[PDB]
């Protein structure tokens, strides 16, 4: 979604440094408001101490700051963040791999549902759409980006993902629960009907198609699960309490105390707490990692591009089972027909990458 | 890619020490430029303090260095590095195992696509090439090493990975999305056509071949996923901010202060901060681990050898389904035909490795 994969292809001088200059889906964009509030509260307190408090009050503030500063402990906060963010990141990738792709059903339906006639065409296209509908229905249930595109079941129909007859059949089936599973049932029934009409040769080929469907159903189930079963609220609250506890301490503890009073650790007044602000970016930004990925189907810069996926899948699916049904290119003898050990060419820039075969560590390289 | 597996086969005296003398894909090669800039900035600051600053300015610098040094904290940085690098290393190996190998399809196509005639040969060879094409297409989409070898679809054709007719069929199919999935559809269709021509006996054998294809498709999908879905930018930025924050502190904090002034902790002036530089190699090098593996399909020394894989697969694939179709050696009685409990010999050096059978922990060894 915010792909910088190509920038970090090689480990050169500024591989990671360069990324500090990027705004989209960045630490700056996510921390902006919070940082400003922190900045404000800090310097506000700072001026109160420098310009308002009396000599006696200043002595209390200095004692208060020494107290607060002693409770700004990074080690405990770093612990809970690391473990929590790891959980979030784990679920994040699991949710991606749970986004259903038509390609596997697509390959089978395209080759195993017979007929070069309009019915055979309508059959294959309708099967794929039942798959894609099964997906779109669950996606608009878990993704705010998708839901805002399909707020009502009418939107689904008018967008061409569901026919008005299908919508009629949809409504006819009375159930208080999410009906995303309906198209998945239709598919299996239609696949069976197709086999009985002789459009699907064996049962071996039919079960194979039914299996790939079930897999897609399992995919939709995972998405439902991650959406339903949030990371326990108490856990989420714990890490924010820990993080905020730290910044609360810093607000007062990291204040620049009187240099004259010669407090151990506070010999220099820089007015601006450079390293404390750098710690804020570190920890608040670290928390923002979880904050953004805790729901990867939202509208964050780094949240998944689910609507593009829907579009891509629609186009590719139908194309593969329609225009590509039993439609192949002209079989030719390959360029290496009489060559048992082919030696494909290399461009000028890639010849260094033509390596001798790795036989194994145990063998002498001679 | 940088295989030292054989060097570290045994745990001897210098098993790991020896690796410190290696340059290829080393910590030295990856840190070179960064280290020099660090070195320079350090000693630059050092001379300014020793030769330029006035007695009063020197006192400020010393107070500034004590301030900076107190913010050079390894524990928080070590935390975020460990967790982040672990994520990177995890994806790194996942991406490797997602590189498709023909061998499984290769075995089935070679034995289950009948015919010792030119057509049977052309059939088997064309099937494998559709697999290898499905792979090469995705690899040149995710690997810069491969793309620079196949920058254009013409390169693919001229290299003998795709026929001009196939390229024509390729273009004929209108789609705005990556067409790496096309050959995978062709394969399934061609496999079905092959079965209808009687070249594939049962549907059981056909579905078995279609399954291994789908598996390869899933492999290609994973590669696409890891390439598309980068590790969240914010996370990457956080760890570089943390790391750089540390080295910023060290630049000033680790300066050798006046020995005469007798600052606690700064009693000795060595001019060169040995241990601070050693910490740089540690942490900057630790970050370089992630920096290099965040995209294992790039052109780093330790990035995958994808082009060799392509070459190896091409050679082996075709060879197994062509020259090796129904082609076996002469069946003989094995050397242990009349021996129920064979005792294969051992070389002089390996006799110590002839062990008695491990029956289980519970049994008395008598």
């Amino acid at each position: 979604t915010v792909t910088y994969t190509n920038r970090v292809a090689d480990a050169r001088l500024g591989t990671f440094s360069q990324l500090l200059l990027q705004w989209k889906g960045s630490i700056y964009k996510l921390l902006y408001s919070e940082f400003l509030i922190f900045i404000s509260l800090y310097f506000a307190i700072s001026l109160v101490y420098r310009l308002i408090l009396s000599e006696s009050q200043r002595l209390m503030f200095e004692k208060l700051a020494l107290y607060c500063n002693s409770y700004a402990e990074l080690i405990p906060v770093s612990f809970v963040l690391g473990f929590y963010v790891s959980l979030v990141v784990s679920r994040w990738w699991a949710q991606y791999e749970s986004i259903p792709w038509p390609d596997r059903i697509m390959n089978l339906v395209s080759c195993n549902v017979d007929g070069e006639d309009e019915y055979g065409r309508l059959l294959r296209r309708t099967l794929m759409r039942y798959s894609n509908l099964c997906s779109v229905l669950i996606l608009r249930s878990v993704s705010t980006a998708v839901y805002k595109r399909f707020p009502s079941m009418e939107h689904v129909v008018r967008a061409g993902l569901m026919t008005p007859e299908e919508h009629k059949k949809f409504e006819s089936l009375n159930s208080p629960h999410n009906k995303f599973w309906i198209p998945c049932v239709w598919f299996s029934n239609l696949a069976v009907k197709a086999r009985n009409e002789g459009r699907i040769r064996d049962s071996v080929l039919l079960q194979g198609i039914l299996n790939e469907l079930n897999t897609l159903r399992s995919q939709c189930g995972r998405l439902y699960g991650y959406d339903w079963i949030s990371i326990p609220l108490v856990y989420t609250q714990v890490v924010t309490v820990a993080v905020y506890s730290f910044f609360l301490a810093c607000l007062i503890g990291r204040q620049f105390l009187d240099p004259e009073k010669a407090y151990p650790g506070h010999e220099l007044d820089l007015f601006v707490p450079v390293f404390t602000f750098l710690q804020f970016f570190f920890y608040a930004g670290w928390l923002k990692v979880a904050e953004q990925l805790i729901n990867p189907f939202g509208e964050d810069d780094d949240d998944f591009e689910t609507n593009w996926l829907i579009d891509r899948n629609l186009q590719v699916s139908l194309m593969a089972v329609d225009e590509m049904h039993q439609d192949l290119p002209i079989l030719e003898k390959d360029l290496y027909w009489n060559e048992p050990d082919p030696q494909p060419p290399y461009t000028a820039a890639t010849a260094e990458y033509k390596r001798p075969s790795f036989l194994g560590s145990t063998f002498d390289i001679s | 890619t940088v295989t030292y597996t054989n060097r570290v086969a045994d745990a001897r005296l210098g098993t790991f020490s020896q690796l410190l003398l290696q340059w290829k894909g080393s910590i030295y090669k990856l840190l070179y430029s960064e280290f020099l800039i660090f070195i320079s900035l350090y000693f630059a600051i050092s001379l300014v303090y020793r030769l330029i600053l006035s007695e009063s300015q020197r006192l400020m610098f010393e107070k500034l260095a004590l301030y900076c040094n107190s913010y050079a904290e390894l524990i928080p940085v070590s935390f975020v590095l460990g967790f982040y690098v672990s994520l990177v290393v995890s994806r790194w190996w996942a991406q490797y195992e997602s590189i498709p190998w023909p061998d499984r399809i290769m075995n089935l196509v070679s034995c289950n696509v009948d015919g010792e005639d030119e057509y049977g040969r052309l059939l088997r060879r064309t099937l494998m090439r559709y697999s290898n094409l499905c792979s090469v297409l995705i690899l040149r989409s995710v690997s810069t090493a491969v793309y620079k070898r196949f920058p254009s679809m013409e390169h693919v054709v001229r290299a003998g990975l795709m026929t001009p007719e196939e390229h024509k069929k390729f273009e004929s199919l209108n789609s705005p999305h990556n067409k790496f999935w096309i050959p995978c559809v062709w394969f399934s269709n061609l496999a079905v056509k092959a079965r209808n021509e009687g070249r594939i006996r049962d549907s059981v054998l056909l579905q078995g071949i279609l399954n291994e294809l789908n598996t390869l498709r899933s492999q290609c999908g994973r590669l696409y996923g890891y390439d598309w879905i980068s590790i969240p930018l914010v996370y990457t930025q956080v760890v570089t901010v943390a790391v750089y924050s540390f080295f910023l502190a060290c630049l000033i904090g680790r300066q050798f202060l006046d020995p005469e002034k007798a600052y606690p902790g700064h009693e000795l002036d060595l001019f060169v901060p040995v241990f601070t530089f050693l910490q740089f190699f540690f942490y900057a090098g630790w970050l370089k681990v992630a920096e290099q593996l965040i995209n294992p399909f790039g052109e780093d020394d330790d990035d995958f050898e994808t082009n060799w894989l392509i070459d190896r697969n091409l050679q082996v694939s075709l060879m197994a389904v062509d020259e090796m179709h129904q082609d076996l050696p002469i069946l003989e009685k094995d050397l242990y035909w009349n021996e129920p409990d064979p005792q294969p010999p051992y070389t002089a050096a390996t006799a110590e490795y002839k062990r008695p059978s491990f029956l289980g922990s519970t049994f008395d060894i008598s």
């Epitope: 060419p345 820039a349 010849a351 033509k354 | 920058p151 254009s152 290299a159």
Partner: antibody, heavy 116, light 108 residues
């Protein structure tokens, strides 16, 4: 149809610098590496260097390290080469070619003459 | 660098004849060799690539062969057009050095 149109011939004084062009058309500019070849009478063709239109990555010949400079303009689909500290020996015919495991398309050529 | 040694420096033959130019590699370049034809004043043209494969326009009378360090171009049944310059180039690595060239002149 693939066509590489280079700039016209040039005439410069020793020590100066020159910058010749090469406009590609009839194919995707960024998907093929652009090379530059030097042609002197009696001598063999010399490879100056190559450029990746996409990322502007250059790879020169050690023999031309300080003499030649490469860059492109993806917007205008043209490639450029700059020759510095020109001498009499820098006088020759300069080509730009497209690579596809081979040089399948060359420019007409750009004749450079250096004398005072 | 890889050195390309071409021979003969110049060949003289009459229409109908069959000639053979030869390029030899300093080191193994597998099947990575190309043959170019260049007529005086004009820019070179691709004849053969990958040591054997002929390009689009090239007529069947042209053929390439070899592998490793020994390659050769063979023009059987010469024509009036086939007279001019001929050189080779390896395509295994950078820099892709060229051959010395060969002048194919008419014999009388």
């Amino acid at each position: 149809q693939v066509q590489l149109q280079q700039s016209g011939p040039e005439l410069v004084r020793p020590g100066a610098s020159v910058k010749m062009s090469c406009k590609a058309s009839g194919y995707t500019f960024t998907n093929y590496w652009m090379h530059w070849v030097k042609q002197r009478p009696g001598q063999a063709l010399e490879w100056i260097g190559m450029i990746d239109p996409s990322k502007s990555e250059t790879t020169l010949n050690q023999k031309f390290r300080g003499k030649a400079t490469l860059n492109v303009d993806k917007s205008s689909n043209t490639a450029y080469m700059q020759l510095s500290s020109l001498t009499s020996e820098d006088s020759a015919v300069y080509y730009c070619a497209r690579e596809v495991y081979y040089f399948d398309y060359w420019g007409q050529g750009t004749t450079l003459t250096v004398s005072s | 660098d890889i050195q390309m040694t071409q021979s003969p420096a110049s060949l003289s033959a009459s229409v109908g004849e069959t000639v053979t130019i030869t390029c030899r590699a300093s080191e193994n370049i597998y099947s990575y060799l190309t043959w170019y034809q260049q007529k005086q004043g004009k820019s070179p043209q691709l004849l053969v690539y990958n040591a054997k494969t002929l390009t689009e326009g090239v007529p069947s009378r042209f053929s390439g062969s070899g592998s490793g360090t020994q390659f050769s171009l063979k023009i059987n049944s010469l024509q009036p057009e086939d007279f001019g310059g001929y050189f080779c180039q390896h395509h295994y690595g950078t820099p892709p050095t060229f051959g010395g060239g060969t002048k194919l002149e008419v014999k009388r």
